[PDB]
Design a protein around this ligand. Sequence first.
Ligand code: SF4
Ligand code: SF4
Ligand code: SF4
Lengths: 628, 628
Amino acid sequence: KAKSIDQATLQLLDKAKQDGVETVWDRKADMKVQCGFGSAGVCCRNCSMGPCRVSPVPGKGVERGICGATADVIVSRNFARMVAAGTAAHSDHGRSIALSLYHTSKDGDIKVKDENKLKEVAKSFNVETEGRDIYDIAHDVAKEGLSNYGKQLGEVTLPPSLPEKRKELWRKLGVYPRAVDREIAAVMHSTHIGCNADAEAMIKMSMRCSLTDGWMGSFMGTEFSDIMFGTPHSIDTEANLGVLEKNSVNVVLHGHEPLLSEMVVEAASDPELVELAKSVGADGINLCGMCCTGNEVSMRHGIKIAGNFMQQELAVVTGAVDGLIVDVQCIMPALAKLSKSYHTKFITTSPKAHITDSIYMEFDEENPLDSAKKILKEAILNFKNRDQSKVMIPELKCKAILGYSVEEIINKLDKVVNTQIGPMQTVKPLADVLVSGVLRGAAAVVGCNNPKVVQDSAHIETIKGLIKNDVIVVVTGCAAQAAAKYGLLQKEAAEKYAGPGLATVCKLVDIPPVLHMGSCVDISRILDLVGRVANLLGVDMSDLPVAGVAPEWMSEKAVAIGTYVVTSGIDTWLGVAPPVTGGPEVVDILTNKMEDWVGAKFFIETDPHKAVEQIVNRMNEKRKKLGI
Amino acid sequence: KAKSIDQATLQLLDKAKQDGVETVWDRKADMKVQCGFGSAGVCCRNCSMGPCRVSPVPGKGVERGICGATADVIVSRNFARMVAAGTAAHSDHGRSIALSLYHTSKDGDIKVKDENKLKEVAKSFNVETEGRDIYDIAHDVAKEGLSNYGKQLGEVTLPPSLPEKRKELWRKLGVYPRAVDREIAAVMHSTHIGCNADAEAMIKMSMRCSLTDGWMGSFMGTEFSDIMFGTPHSIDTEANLGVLEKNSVNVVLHGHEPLLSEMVVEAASDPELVELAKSVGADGINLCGMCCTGNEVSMRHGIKIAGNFMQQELAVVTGAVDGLIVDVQCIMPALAKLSKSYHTKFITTSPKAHITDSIYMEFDEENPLDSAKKILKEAILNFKNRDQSKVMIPELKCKAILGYSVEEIINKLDKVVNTQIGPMQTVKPLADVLVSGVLRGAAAVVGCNNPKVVQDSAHIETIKGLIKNDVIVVVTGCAAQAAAKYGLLQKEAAEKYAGPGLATVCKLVDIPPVLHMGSCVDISRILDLVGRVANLLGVDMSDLPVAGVAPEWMSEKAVAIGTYVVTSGIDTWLGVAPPVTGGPEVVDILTNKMEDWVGAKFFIETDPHKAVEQIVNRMNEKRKKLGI
Ligand code: SF4
Ligand code: SF4
Ligand code: SF4
């Protein structure tokens, strides 16, 4: 089968074959037929009595592990641990952001750039703002956010966009969230040998844990990032590997933590570093981003996006990356080995993400700007080691428009508001187009790449099908970057791919049919948007014609995201089967019984066209339930 | 191979074969040859690009996972997740204890029974005590303990017995602990795909996480349990399955959390329940404990111990267990199936541990005594369903002495203190016998059973070898219960098994050669003891001739325990190989490089006699280093 639908990706794969280096596709081929027990989730290693593998087919073979655990128990515990790991990644990101907020000052490297957003957040956290210094408010807000992570007494703080009905449903179900780290610890405790051996209770614990990601960790990370670095607005950028410059220093920012990439962007305008780039024979400094850190700097500053997850290696294969600076998460360790075949300096910066044989330059949060400057200086000085005979940058780049935060979307919707009617600054125009049926619904396309799927194929096919069916699409993460590379993040795309209702809406509001809402933590924005719509219509989020899709997901973070999206009341389609087919009870809970609990459920569909059809049918069913 | 060295265990295995019921041994046999990849730790399932298996033999076969992770990376992440799971189990136990402390009242079900212990703990937590109400002090202490779990700013609180040198070494190494749930979340975050791919850093993160178990979670759980339920003192009890009564109601308490078992013990003396037991035709109520909850109620009240981990099923096989009340952890789910073959009521009580097809009676912490009375009444009423023709109780039980908390040990040591010299109430006599060489050292024997080892064989052989070599032995958990069943927890055992120096010490102090220090969380007591000795000698804990042994461990909790014991500076022998042989770098870190970091290291030895020899040699070389 084809490795990708992206032509630049294919050219660089040919180059990597010529250079004798191996990619993620080569390692996937080397893995051959993957273990059936692990693929079905019926393998357990939770204690040293094991490893235990039970039959994925009930009634045949070994039925129980040594402790007596059934296939359903093993599957449910494995699924819960995936959710806990994803929640941990997102919560650690949000915790770093909250600590950065706590360390803001007027004359420091980290300031408050959006005071209005900070005051609204302070209102949401019961922090007084009138007649107060802005940094005192910021510190109080950071304290409340940090308490959300580890409070042992009392209730956590949740955003006002979350409907009261959803909160009450969670409380009745027993999944109402506690402090984030406490829920992660609870999930890890209940999967220990000889604890929870009941699939339904295990799934409910995992949902409870995922809620602390969706509504607390990711939400606080996003809102505090907006406070410190600015709320995203409509902004132009370029996407795909063609953004690399042969005649300039190329600095590629990979990872998820935004403070480092923000400081690197600021350092790139330093006169001394620009002069140094000129002195090593380069035209200038060309910052490019990848994955979620690329999404953040692109949403807030228009930094060009070099590529998504499965392109990271190919970025090095060009031979033009002088410095690859990585913080945490979704950083293929093979990059270190790959960097030996080129001049590239592979720089790790976080104590959480040491990588063997990489150059470690710890990013100092006490002096973020100076630390970013020294890291960037190492990248710039590496330009002298460039071998221009090994350089091949495909001439394939695509224009994209992004920056669609909830605030930006509301500002855009204000155009189609009659002044004599109003109100202004609400999601009411979006609610109106959804209720009238001009738009059939809204769908979030999120997730990673996965060698099991032709890279970016499922993302593009799902998005095109949805917008052709007058479903407005919001995108995050690597799916958003696939849309950017393909050319869907363009106003012209409305008349090229969208159906009649969505084309009319795009023309009236002057937006692309596909709205890039940011990184994987920025999925919280999607929740926020949906919540607002629900609160405007006086219904729960499970009554709306909305859906989420993860066509090509790979990470534990994706599992946690899908779990909290379903738990919030939004049906989720998974384009890659999770390792649960071995447990019939777990499959039945996730795809059938979940609808009785939270009004939504998982859909597993590896065919994107069938997924689009199912999404449209489900949205029409919910519309008929709602009367619209 | 023999299944056990215990004769009562063998008789009940014959009965289980005659009854056509499966045991843990039968399921272990059914599992046959366990997966080599999982056994070596070279299998990874951390993302849905996998499952990935790399060769346990370097230089052959597949070398890297799909993301590029090496065998060392996969092994180190798997080990770190085991540590995180064990830390989560212990920390959740301690968190429940702290919450119970927070709800103590003068006229409530949960009171303060050891005010002196509470005042000393309050001193350790910087809580004022002079001229204050005892329950105000208790609530402040509980608040400080709870803050240890989830504080995001500042430093955690550690017991005064921990040497300053050990803390400084931890700070220099980068493993100084943070809040417990924060460290669990950090480990889970760094094992996520594309985060940490460096074995040394991964092992250091796991050590940092395990410290929050050893010195914060388990320590606080133990000390708060002492405050609420009484400090253990020397007390007599009986051990092994013979403690069951044919003519009495048999109520078996299995699990770890002590509040439920304490309330059940209190409810058993209720006049209405005793009258009900008489009216259902029984002579009375016979409470028996298993595993750690049995250890707690036995340490504090002399409740008879029915058996350790791999005996739990056999307790039901007798046909005499009218009620089996379980809370969390090390509860084989197969019990639910097994109790169908008998009249036994298998009662789950904790929302953390639901077991399918068991009778769920949620233990209400708000009204603990009434809830315990209701559960106990269900067990008593089940006596009418006893089938006395199916009853077979082995006439095999053994006298044991336990209750050796640090306070009790100090009280015993006061006997050999010359009044004209002093001081009293210190560990000084123990330090003196260790320094003089009358005792060669002290060894902690802890851990579970494991079907991979003849049950209780390794525990007994290791303990007998150590005490024969004049090494005083402290025991916890299932190892302590194996010693109890065998008969080592007896004063007579001193003249039957101990060497000359240990026999003299036992005669002078009037103690058994093997000291039962309580449950698995009570391993913190061992730490406390060692710390005191170190603080009395002005040395670090790694300079002492001390060791820990886990001859037959199975649980993730055991992994976390061994990790924090080694990190504290105490060499640890493992009688069951952990899944790390696939990663040569991880093996080298755990067994060789750890000594450079923390002055102690792991020893993997499956032969108990060889383990005793190695322990004696290591203790002698540490003595020669210390000059004693
Ligand atoms: S999933 Fe289990 S059975 Fe399959 S290779 Fe991995 S450890 Fe072995
Ligand atoms: S927890 Fe149970 S099923 Fe899992 S490895 Fe241990 S004995 Fe086997
Ligand atoms: S994290 Fe890497 S090694 Fe582990 S399953 Fe995913 S791709 Fe394979």
